[PDB]
Write a protein that binds this DNA or RNA. Sequence first.
RNA 1: GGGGACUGCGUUCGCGCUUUCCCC
RNA 2: GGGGACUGCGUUCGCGCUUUCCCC
Lengths: 89, 95
Amino acid sequence: FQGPVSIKVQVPNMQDKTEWKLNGQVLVFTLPLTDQVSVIKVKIHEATGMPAGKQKLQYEGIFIKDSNSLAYYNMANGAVIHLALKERG
Amino acid sequence: LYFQGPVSIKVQVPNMQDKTEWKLNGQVLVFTLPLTDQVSVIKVKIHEATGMPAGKQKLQYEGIFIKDSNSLAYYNMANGAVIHLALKERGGRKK
RNA sequence: GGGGACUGCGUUCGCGCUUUCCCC
RNA sequence: GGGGACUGCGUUCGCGCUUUCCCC
């Protein structure tokens, strides 16, 4: 059986970022476990306008890397990815 | 039939023993120079006597900061004129 | 931004201009 | 030398690099 996993992305609420759609919403994506974490950033960009280089992703306290797979982090159905605006310095 | 002779001037040298390349021992120099000589000639005589280059010398005569291009006559120097010698120190904003 | 040295010059002797540099 | 913004980016989340700059 197995299959793609359903993941949740907690988007921040940042109304001052008027060019992006950061409304504190939860995105639901279903992705293969073999997908790289960068696919999450593609889906988030499509959903919010926020480019991948501006996104910082955290999963159960882990700063997950774009080049690694979802399987590398042992994500299951309902895995919650916390999205933050990446801060320089 | 009068002919204006040279003037005898005295240079009070400072006592600065830390300037080991020069002879600044607090001595008094005596030079005899024509009144038509430029003040710059005094610095030459001082350089010859003390090793101190003309560009490092500051001269003062009766409170006047005399200028190199002017003559001794311009400053009305007479026999026994006392030239005070000091070290020139440059200034300037930090670059 | 600050400290220091140096090349030469101007000065109302307080400083300023300038050259080549070093350090924080 | 120090503090910071900005471009792209890295991070072991303490920070780092980079781009164009600002302030002292």
